[PDB]
C-alpha cells in the first residue's frame, strides 16, 4: 500500500470536504465509502448520495474507480451508477487526488449537463426532469443512511 494513499487518507480524514463524508473501508484501505449531500438549490437538495470509490493497482498513475450506489435521476449518471467525468478517464493526471474527484462529482450534482433517455428528458422538458430528480431524491436519497 503506497505511502501516497496513506497520506491522502490521513489528510482526507483530517480536513474533510464540506458536504462530503469519505472514509476508507475497515477491511480494504483501497476502498472508500462516500456520502455526498445534495447541493442546496438543486433538485437533489436534502438528499444524501452514497458512492463507492476504490484505488486500482496503478494509482495514482491510473484514475480511481467511482460508482454511484444511490439511485439518482441525473443526465451524467447512468442506470449502472457510472458517472461521465473527464478526469476519470483521459483527463486524469498523477497530480490529481481523491479530493479533486470528490469535488468534481459534487460539482456535477450542482450542474447537470444534458448536452441516454435521462438526458433526453432534461433536454426536451427540463422543468419536468428536475421534478423527477426531486422525486427520486425523496424516494432513494432520503432516510437512506
Amino acid at each position: 500500500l503506497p505511502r501516497r494513499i496513506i497520506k491522502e487518507t490521513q489528510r482526507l480524514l483530517a480536513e474533510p470536504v464540506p458536504g462530503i463524508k469519505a472514509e476508507p473501508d475497515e477491511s480494504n484501505a483501497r476502498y472508500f465509502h462516500v456520502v455526498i449531500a445534495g447541493p442546496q438549490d438543486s433538485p437533489f437538495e436534502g438528499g444524501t448520495f452514497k458512492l463507492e470509490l476504490f484505488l486500482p493497482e496503478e494509482y495514482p498513475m491510473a484514475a480511481p474507480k467511482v460508482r454511484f450506489m444511490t439511485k439518482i435521476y441525473h443526465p451524467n449518471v447512468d442506470k449502472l451508477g457510472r458517472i461521465c467525468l473527464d478526469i476519470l478517464k483521459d483527463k486524469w493526471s498523477p497530480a490529481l487526488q481523491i479530493r479533486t474527484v470528490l469535488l468534481s462529482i459534487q460539482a456535477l450534482l450542482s450542474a447537470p449537463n444534458p448536452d441516454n433517455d435521462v438526458a433526453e428528458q432534461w433536454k426536451t422538458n427540463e422543468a419536468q426532469a428536475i421534478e423527477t430528480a426531486r422525486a427520486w431524491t425523496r424516494l432513494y436519497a432520503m432516510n437512506n443512511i
Partner: protein, 63 residues
C-alpha cells in the same frame, strides 16, 4: 503560515517534501525520482528541466 509554506514545497506526486526538486518553467516542481506538466499541463521541452537548489534549502530549513 507554516502549513501553507510546507504545502508549497510538497511534491504533488508522492505528496512528500520535495527531494532533489526539479522545476518546470511554469513554476511547478517535483522530486527528481518523480519524473506536459502533471499539474498545469503547460508543455515543456524535456531539457528545460532545471534543479532548484534554493527550494531544496528551504525544504531543509523547514523540518
Amino acid at each position: 503560515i507554516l502549513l501553507n509554506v510546507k504545502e508549497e514545497v510538497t511534491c504533488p506526486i508522492c505528496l512528500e517534501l520535495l527531494t532533489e526538486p526539479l522545476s518546470l518553467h511554469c513554476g511547478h516542481s517535483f522530486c527528481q525520482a518523480c519524473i506536459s506538466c502533471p499539474v498545469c499541463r503547460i508543455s515543456y521541452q524535456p531539457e528545460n528541466i532545471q534543479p532548484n537548489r534554493h527550494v531544496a534549502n528551504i525544504v531543509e530549513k523547514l523540518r
